[PDB]
Design a protein around this ligand. Structure first.
Ligand SMILES: CCCCCCCCCCCCCCCC(=O)OC[C@H](COP(=O)(O)OC[C@@H](O)CO)OC(=O)CCCCCCCCCCCCCCC
Ligand SMILES: CCCCCCCCCCCCCCCC(=O)OC[C@H](COP(=O)(O)OC[C@@H](O)CO)OC(=O)CCCCCCCCCCCCCCC
Ligand SMILES: Nc1nc2c(c(=O)[nH]1)N[C@H]1C(S)=C(S)[C@@H](COP(=O)(O)OP(=O)(O)OC[C@H]3O[C@@H](n4cnc5c(=O)[nH]c(N)nc54)[C@H](O)[C@@H]3O)O[C@H]1N2
Ligand SMILES: Nc1nc2c(c(=O)[nH]1)N[C@H]1C(S)=C(S)[C@@H](COP(=O)(O)OP(=O)(O)OC[C@H]3O[C@@H](n4cnc5c(=O)[nH]c(N)nc54)[C@H](O)[C@@H]3O)O[C@H]1N2
Ligand SMILES: CCCCCCCCCCCCCC(=O)O
Ligand code: SF4
Ligand code: SF4
Ligand code: SF4
Ligand code: SF4
Ligand code: FES
Ligand SMILES: [Mo+4]
Ligand SMILES: [S]
Lengths: 86, 975, 86
């Protein structure tokens, strides 16, 4: 065991392996701040978008914008931008 | 001078011929996958790419010139090394955690680790060949083969067997055995060199397969997908190399690696035994091994099965009528003490003889003679040296004064000429012969072979003369007479260093070239060539064995060899000397410790009142003044009601003494017979008490080889069952008689003996630790003697003695006995095969004895391979199958010793022995042949090495690899 | 166990299962490079955006001017500026 641990610690002593463990612990702390309780409706909407994307120029961007389905999404995207600001 | 600048820093070069040699001594990091110091440079791996003055060159071959600017760190040199490694990795699959070669010493593994490699540029592609698992001992895995040619260099230029070559001209190169035949059917003598020198698992011992690792036991059906899963998952090489390193470290719990000295022949090979529990995984040789280096033969490398044989004796046996009763150690020792005391009181101490084993250690020989002289009170001690080079020691005692070889195996490989007389050197002393074969094959050493049978040494010799059996002294005396009279003798040497010159030249009178041509059969013209070669060579080593000594004039012919060497001045200088090749693993040491009737340890004469008095004070008891019986003489004294007891340890006397019908007859008469052995030998069947002894692997002690080299044994396994190591038994027998010996380890026995034996004064176990050795005479200061007679000869005046010797005509059996049955050994088998027949891999390729018949005699008698014949002599008869071969000529046949029944060679041999040293004349045996059966299966299978087809060559032929279109030197990858 | 491991390894031997384990290990190495220490303020801002995007009822032109919007779009432009290094 003394040799196994010696090999293990000596190989993990690299700065690359230290950062991997450092950011793994830091990632859980980041997730603790992230309010995933209020993500429920947003995840249901992103889910419905993925579902419609499975079912398959300049003139079309104008036509597609202001559409009932599009307007709800772009206004929600603008509402998300409004929130980011303190 | 030679000043070199490596990586900017300037330094003074010592004796390093190559750049890599300097880099290694300077502790500078440089890959060398194909470089093994024992083999020399090969230039196959291309990983030592360093910049010698801006030019990318392989450092292993690059000669270190004065004023060379070598760089081993620039990005281009490292980019070239990785390129060479990529081709190694394309030919070798890394699966280390589940590989048996992941034992910390894998050169591919540690090179990938050293080079900080994480990816492999050329993906591993399987070679279009299947594994050659035909051989019983090792196997070839072509997919793991990197084509480094280390095995080829070993087979061709170190072992000099020449089975292995690399087919470079093939689309996918591969190691070939002979002309690409299966390993088992090839000329592969199973020496083990190729697996030993292989840097990976490509050539591995079958003993290692599935045993060494923790996950290697997993069936290949499950392990193969595991490797494929791991290969796909793998992030980097360093990550899974760390996992494999932790598992490699863990192996230290199960695998035990122990240094030992080979239990077989006198070459004295030392090596490590790798054992997982009681299983021997592999015999791993070490470069530090003083006598052999990385070299081994089939017996030392793979012939250790006997230690675990189900036939091993584990409990003492006391005869109970028509059977043996298994009895407790106490009752067996108590009975030996009661009966030994009974015959000592009623018939005297001299009615008890004691036989030491040259298979056993120096301390065990010392205790057997201490029991005989100090406890029983008789000088009736002896060992198998009596049937062996006892005439050779008599010859050396008469002329140079020391009972041992003149120098080391290193002096033999250095010699300008090697004269081999009556010695099957490549089969009886294989590792010693590899030095001669390499020197002759590569250094151009002259080799003269005088023999009646065309063996490997005869086939490879520069001059092969075939004298008539027993006529050797006639031509030896004639060479000396011609050299002395033609003025070609070393007169400066003979002057200040030799005595009895004029009396010697008077005794050479009858031995004229005409007489020699008449008696020996060697023509005068070739006799001139022999004398000219012997005389013109600056250094001559004369190696003789049982072809010389097992004769009536054996002591005299041995003396003639020493006399010839004195004449030509081949003594006291490196590369020259007398080399009577010592038989058993420890025959030199058994004699060195007083296991002779006439001498005490250190060869100090028994009749010497001053020597006896020294031992009396130390042992605390009076020593018998009168000498004792010899090993041969002992059976005569049983027959004449003079010898009532015999304590024989590790000697198969019932098969190895001459005239075994007379031997067996004396065994029925014998009052008390104690046989101490590891198996119930033929001899042990005649015993009243059999004591289970433990072999070399189950004990500690020391052995002294052919070079007078004292080497230490470490315990590999604990003694099996109730079998005890021989020293422990001898001590317990002596203690039952009131000796009160208190040894706890053989090192205690050695300390006592070194004080008494003057030639062993400076030997201590501390000086013999690990691969350390000492060559006797060793003075109290620890200073050994690698080369004898450098300053003077050990005689009162410091001068050697020329000894007048006459030809003694070999014993004639009668006109009716027209077949001259020559006898000896086989490379693979050790004597009747008590040890070697337990090795099933050896048994597989050589299952039985055979009678070599010449094509001439086979034509005359209508003999084919397998013909059962009956050789009959005036002493007994053998029934043996036949084998036709041009190794024997005319009416001389060859019957090897590997048989314990119907074909036991000693049924034919007579009790006629040497006139001075009582060594049975085994090479003077005649018999008449009577056909018994005509049709039978050949006694030598197709898989025997003698049925091969070697492909001799110098080196690996790396130039053929460079000639290919696909070959691109890694250094050349610049633009 | 010899049979259980035989079944297990044989079923996982698929190159689909090998890739899953390969990218799982590499994912941790990727996370080791990702500076999640400095993510704290960004996560708090993205958290406030999610919170405001749940309270829902030419507009793209009108909305692109609000003090709350400008802080977010300038921070989004600042993020793009960072992705221009060697
Ligand atoms: C197939 C391959 C299997 C490989 C198994 C995977 C490795 C398992 C762990 C190695 C053996 C441990 C088990 C072992 O034998 O360890 C050996 C370690 C050293 O022991 P020594 O023999 O040197 O002496 C112990 C002294 O503390 C008292 O005598 O003993 C401990 O105290 C370990 C305590 C838990 C571990 C300490 C911290 C671990 C590292 C944390 C920081 C670095 C990040 C990583
Ligand atoms: C309830 C529903 C069923 C639940 C089944 C659960 C199965 C869990 C795992 C089974 C293992 C049990 C245990 C088992 O089957 O042991 C059996 C396995 C093979 O044993 P053998 O009898 O073949 O002999 C082993 C020889 O080396 C010595 O005798 O022994 C080992 O040494 C395994 C050590 C760990 C092996 C690691 C496996 C890694 C798999 C992935 C490979 C790629 C890694 C990168
Ligand atoms: N593989 C193996 N090696 C062994 C042993 C073993 O059993 N197996 N035993 C060990 C022991 S104890 C011993 S002593 C040594 C024996 O080692 P060697 O003496 O080398 O062995 P043998 O073959 O018994 O010796 C016989 C040789 O001398 C030749 N010969 C026979 N008669 C004459 C003759 O009159 N003149 C000449 N010039 N040659 C003759 C034979 O043809 C053959 O070459 O080997 C040791 N090494
Ligand atoms: N016809 C003929 N006869 C010959 C010869 C010849 O060339 N021709 N050669 C002669 C010569 S040179 C020799 S030296 C002899 C060889 O004759 P021996 O010296 O008797 O030779 P091996 O048959 O090796 O016998 C070795 C025995 O020791 C046992 N043994 C092995 N290791 C140990 C151990 O550690 N302790 C104990 N107690 N026992 C052990 C083995 O089981 C085996 O029974 O043969 C002689 N006989
Ligand atoms: C004693 C069990 C032997 C049967 C197991 C065979 C696997 C041996 C492990 C060596 C590495 C696998 C060989 C290979 O995949 O080429
Ligand atoms: S032979 Fe060496 S490099 Fe190859 S898999 Fe085994 S340990 Fe690894
Ligand atoms: S078998 Fe020969 S060429 Fe192949 S890796 Fe082993 S030593 Fe090198
Ligand atoms: S004789 Fe056989 S075991 Fe020895 S090196 Fe040659 S091929 Fe390998
Ligand atoms: S040459 Fe002799 S000592 Fe060396 S391995 Fe072979 S039998 Fe053993
Ligand atoms: S060691 Fe020099 S190329 Fe192999
Ligand atoms: Mo011998
Ligand atoms: S011997």
């Amino acid at each position: 065991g003394d040799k196994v641990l010696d090999i293990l610690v000596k190989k993990a002593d690299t700065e690359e392996t230290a950062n991997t463990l450092k950011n793994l612990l830091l990632l859980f702390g980041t997730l603790g701040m992230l309010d995933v309780k209020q993500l429920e409706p947003l995840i249901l909407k992103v889910n419905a978008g993925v579902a419609s994307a499975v079912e398959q120029g300049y003139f079309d961007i104008i036509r597609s914008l202001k559409d009932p389905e599009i307007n709800k999404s772009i206004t929600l995207l603008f509402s998300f931008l409004k929130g980011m600001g303190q | 001078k030679k000043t070199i600048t490596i990586n900017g820093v300037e330094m003074e070069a010592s004796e390093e011929q190559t750049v890599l040699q300097l880099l290694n001594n300077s502790s500078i990091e440089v890959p060398q996958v194909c470089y093994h110091p024992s083999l020399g440079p090969i230039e196959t791996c291309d990983t030592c790419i360093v910049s010698i003055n801006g030019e990318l060159k392989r450092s292993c071959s690059a000669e270190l010139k004065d004023g060379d600017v070598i760089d081993t760190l620039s990005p281009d040199v490292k980019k070239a090394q990785v390129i060479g490694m990529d081709k190694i990795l394309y030919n070798h699959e890394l699966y280390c955690t589940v590989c048996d070669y992941n034992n910390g010493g894998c050169e591919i593994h540690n090179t990938v680790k050293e080079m900080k490699i994480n990816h492999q540029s050329i993906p591993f592609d399987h070679k279009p060949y299947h594994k050659d698992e035909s051989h019983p001992f090792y196997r070839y895995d072509p997919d793991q083969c990197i084509l480094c040619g280390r095995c080829v260099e070993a087979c061709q230029d170190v072992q000099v067997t020449e089975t292995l070559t690399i087919d470079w001209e093939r689309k996918r190169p591969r190691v070939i055995w002979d002309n690409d035949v299966p390993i088992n059917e090839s000329s592969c003598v199973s020496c083990g060199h190729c697996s030993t020198v292989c840097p990976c698992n490509a050539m591995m011992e079958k003993g290692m397969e599935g045993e060494a690792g923790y996950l290697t036991g997993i069936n290949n059906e499950t392990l193969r997908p595991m490797i494929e899963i791991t290969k796909g998952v793998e992030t980097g090489y360093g990550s899974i190399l760390a996992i494999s390193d932790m598992e490699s470290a863990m192996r230290d719990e199960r695998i035990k690696k122990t240094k030992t000295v080979c239990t077989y022949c006198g070459v004295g090979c030392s090596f490590d035994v790798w054992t997982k529990g009681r299983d021997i995984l592999k015999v791993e040789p070490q470069e530090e091994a003083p006598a052999n280096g990385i070299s081994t033969c089939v017996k030392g490398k793979f012939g250790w099965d006997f230690v675990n044989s189900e036939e091993r004796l584990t409990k003492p046996l006391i005869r109970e009528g028509d059977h043996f009763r298994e009895a407790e150690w106490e009752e067996a020792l108590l009975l030996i003490a009661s009966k030994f005391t009974e015959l000592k009181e009623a018939f005297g101490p001299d009615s008890l003889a004691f036989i030491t084993s040259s298979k056993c250690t120096n301390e065990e020989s010392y205790l057997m003679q201490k029991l005989a002289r100090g406890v029983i009170g008789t000088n009736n001690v002896d060992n198998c040296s009596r049937y062996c080079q006892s005439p050779a020691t008599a010859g050396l005692f008469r002329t140079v004064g020391y009972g041992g070889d003149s120098g080391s195996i290193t002096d033999i490989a250095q010699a300008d000429l090697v004269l081999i007389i009556g010695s099957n050197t490549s089969e009886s002393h294989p590792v010693l012969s590899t030095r001669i074969k390499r020197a002759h094959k590569l250094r151009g050493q002259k080799v003269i072979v005088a023999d009646i049978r065309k063996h490997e040494m005869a086939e490879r010799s520069d001059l092969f003369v075939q004298p008539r059996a027993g006529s050797d002294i006639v031509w030896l005396n004639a060479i000396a007479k011609y050299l002395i009279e033609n003025g070609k003798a070393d007169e400066r040497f003979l002057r200040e260093r030799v005595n009895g010159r004029d009396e010697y030249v008077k005794s050479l009178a009858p031995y004229t070239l005409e007489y020699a041509e008449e008696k020996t059969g060697i023509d005068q013209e070739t006799l001139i060539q022999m004398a000219e070669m012997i005389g013109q060579a600056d250094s001559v080593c004369a190696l003789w064995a049982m072809g010389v000594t097992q004769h009536i004039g054996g002591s005299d012919t041995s003396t003639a060899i020493s006399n010839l060497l004195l004449v030509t001045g081949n003594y006291g200088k490196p590369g020259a000397g007398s080399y009577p090749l010592r038989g058993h693993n420890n025959v030199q040491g058994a004699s060195d410790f007083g296991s002779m009737p006439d001498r005490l340890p250190g060869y100090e004469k028994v009749t010497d009142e001053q020597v006896r008095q020294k031992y009396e004070r130390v042992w605390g008891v009076p020593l018998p003044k009168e000498p004792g019986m010899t090993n041969h003489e002992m059976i005569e004294k049983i027959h004449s009601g003079q010898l009532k007891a015999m304590y024989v340890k590790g000697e198969e006397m019932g098969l190895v003494d001459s005239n075994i019908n007379h031997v067996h007859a004396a065994y029925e008469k014998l009052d008390f017979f104690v046989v101490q052995d590891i198996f119930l030998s033929r001899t042990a069947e005649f015993a009243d008490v059999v004591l289970p002894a433990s072999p070399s692997l189950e004990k500690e002690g020391t052995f002294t080889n052919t070079e007078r080299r004292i080497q230490r044994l470490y315990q590999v396994f604990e003694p099996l069952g109730e079998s005890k190591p021989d020293w422990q038994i001898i001590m317990e027998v002596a203690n039952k008689l009131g000796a009160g010996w208190l040894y706890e380890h053989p090192a205690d026995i050695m300390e006592e003996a070194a004080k008494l034996s003057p030639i062993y004064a400076g030997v201590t176990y501390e000086r013999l630790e690990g691969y350390n050795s000492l060559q006797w005479p060793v003075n109290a200061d620890g200073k050994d003697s690698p080369l004898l007679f450098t300053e003077r000869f050990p005689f009162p005046d410091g001068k050697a003695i020329l000894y007048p010797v006459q030809w003694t005509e070999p014993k004639e059996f009668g006109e009716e006995y027209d077949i001259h049955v020559n006898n000896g050994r086989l490379l693979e088998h050790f004597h009747e095969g008590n040890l070697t027949y337990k090795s099933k891999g050896i048994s597989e390729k050589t299952p039985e004895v055979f009678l070599e018949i010449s094509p001439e005699l086979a034509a005359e008698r209508g003999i084919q391979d397998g013909t059962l014949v009956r050789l009959t002599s005036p002493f007994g008869n053998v029934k043996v199958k036949c084998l036709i071969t041009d190794r024997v000529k005319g009416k001389e046949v060859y019957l090897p010793m590997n048989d314990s029944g119907e074909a036991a060679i000693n049924l034919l041999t007579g009790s006629h022995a040497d006139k001075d040293t009582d060594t049975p004349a085994y090479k003077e045996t005649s018999a008449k042949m009577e056909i018994l059966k005509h049709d039978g299966i050949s006694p030598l299978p197709k898989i025997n090495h003698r049925n091969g087809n070697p492909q001799p060559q110098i080196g690996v032929q790396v130039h053929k690899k460079w000639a290919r279109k696909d070959y691109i030197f890694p250094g050349d990858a610049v633009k | 166990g010899d049979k259980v491991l035989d079944i297990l390894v044989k079923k996982a031997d698929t190159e689909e299962t090998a890739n899953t384990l390969k990218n799982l290990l590499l994912l941790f190495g990727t996370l080791g490079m990702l500076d999640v220490k400095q993510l704290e303020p960004l996560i708090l801002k993205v958290n406030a955006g999610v919170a405001s995007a749940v309270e829902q009822k030419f507009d793209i032109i009108r909305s692109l001017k609000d003090p709350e919007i400008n802080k977010s779009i300038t921070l989004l432009f600042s993020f793009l500026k960072g992705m221009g290094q060697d």
